């Protein structure tokens, strides 16, 4: 009875379908169906055995021994080996490959040194001891390492093919092979992606869908129309997006799903571009936002105002609902503005250098940017000009620091607060892009990773978070929800609360 094709929207072309380069929710939406790591995420939101059938940990918690599952194969039928993992991780750490997620592998001994030119890749402590054994040594006991091994930077890639064709990842075809529940059988760039069930997947009997058809419709009204005609089985997040004005009606008819997730919506400042190089200007722009108005009137998705970096759903950080400063604090915003102008020798806001606010082309981002533009004009007398870019282009714009203020969202990679902080540890961190670094911040993050006590560790990270908010390299705006509607016959979808979605075991009733 239940159909076996799932029709969904992913809005736009992914940034990369190389797991070692992907850094974004669009790419990740695809790669989380097509690749599998040493571990995978089960329905309870916890890591479990995936490509590794056994995971051993040394007594000190630093050395991991993965036994590769008997008979695991790539989609072309070749065995998945430990050398595929070694190759992939070293590939992501090789500075020549310019992964923005190389820092995700710094947990491994020798990784940072290799990535920053202070060491050989040969001395990164990931080793295929044999075809079925991967040995990994960490700098510190990392209790969430098996969450990291399910993260897409830690996916294997087919070493044989990647050596043959260094552009293997750029198109569907015989040189694009993967090891997950689904495999990618078509990719029309900027059009659509077709995934089909992967008959070489080890746990294929648990996979019920035969086809996932992913379209790329960046018009939220159209996505909802297609859903309402039954041409899509889902409308909304994580991979699609509902029109903000539909949310009242859908909430009222009882069809809307709304779930808080570990994510934050912020405007990044290029702290090396005037006038955003002045902390008082950054603070004026941040304190002058009315986040309650944005979430009530603009987004309408039950998001909560963010005056902090770490989402309050992170155990130990629930007081971030209140945050580090007052929402809509125009009085204090104006005080910061005056202080900044004085430091420049200026008297009025209109004499500041021109400011551009950038975002990725999107119905909702444009509305938020317009609302913020008005708040800046009205509360500070600051005029900004707006510009928008395609998502995959936009990521590179921010990474190259070709911006002044840039909208971004960050979703948790793993269930620990440091994931919201360590992207800003190093100036040249692949996902930083603010030009900011602070020596005490970095010291505190590094100390956090040697502390096993959860209280003392949470306090080190809260101190770090306070330093970050005091230097305001980004303007927090809101903490995310996922909002969607779906065919209620679609069961078995895994949505862990970090904002990802897995269709591995999904089915129509």
């Amino acid at each position: 009875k239940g159909k076996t094709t799932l029709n969904i929207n992913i809005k736009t072309e992914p940034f990369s379908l190389h797991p070692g380069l992907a850094n974004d929710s669009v790419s990740g939406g695809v790669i989380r169906q097509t690749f599998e790591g040493l571990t995978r995420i089960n329905a309870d939101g916890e890591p479990e055995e995936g490509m590794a059938s056994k995971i051993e940990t040394s007594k000190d918690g630093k050395t991991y021994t993965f036994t590769i599952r008997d008979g695991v194969k790539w989609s072309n039928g070749d065995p998945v080996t430990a050398q595929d993992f070694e190759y992939a991780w070293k590939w992501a750490l090789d500075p020549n490959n310019e992964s923005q997620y190389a820092y995700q592998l710094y947990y491994i001994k020798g990784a940072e040194a290799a990535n920053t030119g202070k060491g050989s890749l040969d001395d990164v402590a990931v080793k295929a001891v044999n075809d079925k054994t991967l040995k990994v040594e960490l700098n510190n006991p990392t209790p969430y390492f098996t969450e990291l091994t399910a993260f897409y930077t830690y996916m294997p890639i087919n070493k044989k093919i990647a050596e043959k064709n260094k552009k293997w990842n750029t198109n569907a075809g015989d040189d694009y092979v993967s090891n997950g529940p689904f495999k990618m059988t078509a990719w029309k760039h900027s059009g659509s992606i077709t995934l089909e069930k992967n008959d070489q997947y080890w746990d294929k009997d648990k996979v019920k869908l035969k086809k996932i058809d992913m379209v790329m419709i960046n018009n939220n009204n159209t996505e909802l129309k297609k859903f309402q005609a039954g041409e899509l089985d889902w409308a909304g997040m994580p991979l699609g997006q509902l029109p903000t004005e539909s949310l009242p009606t859908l909430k009222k008819d009882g069809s809307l799903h709304v779930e808080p997730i570990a994510g934050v919506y912020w405007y990044k400042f290029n702290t090396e571009a005037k006038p955003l190089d002045n902390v008082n200007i950054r603070k004026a722009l941040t304190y002058s936002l009315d986040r309650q108005s944005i979430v009530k009137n603009v987004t309408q998705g039950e998001q909560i105002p963010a005056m902090a970096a770490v989402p309050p759903t992170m155990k130990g950080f629930e007081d971030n609902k209140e945050g580090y400063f007052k929402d809509n604090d125009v009085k204090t915003a104006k005080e910061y503005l005056e202080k900044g102008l004085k430091e420049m020798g200026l008297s009025k806001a209109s004499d500041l250098p021109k400011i551009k606010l950038s975002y990725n082309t999107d119905d909702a981002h444009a509305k938020i940017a317009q609302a913020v533009q008005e708040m800046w004009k009205k509360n500070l007398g600051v005029d900004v000009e707006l510009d928008n870019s395609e998502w995959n282009v936009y990521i590179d714009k921010l990474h190259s620091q070709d911006y002044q203020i840039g909208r971004m969202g960050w979703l948790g990679d793993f269930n620990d607060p440091i994931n919201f902080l360590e992207l800003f540890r190093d100036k040249n961190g692949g996902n930083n892009d603010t030009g900011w670094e602070n020596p005490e911040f970095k010291k505190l993050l590094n100390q956090s990773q040697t502390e096993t006590d959860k209280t003392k560790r949470a306090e080190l990270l809260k101190k770090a978070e306070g330093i970050f908010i005091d230097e305001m390299p980004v303007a927090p705006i809101y903490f995310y929800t996922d909002t969607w509607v779906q065919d209620e016959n679609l069961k078995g979808v895994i949505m862990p609360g970090t904002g990802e979605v897995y269709f591995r075991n999904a089915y129509f009733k």
Binding site: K11, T12, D24, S25, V26, G263, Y265, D362, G409
Partner: peptide, 4 residues
């Protein structure tokens, strides 16, 4: 990860 960066959210679209």
């Amino acid at each position: 990860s960066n959210s679209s």
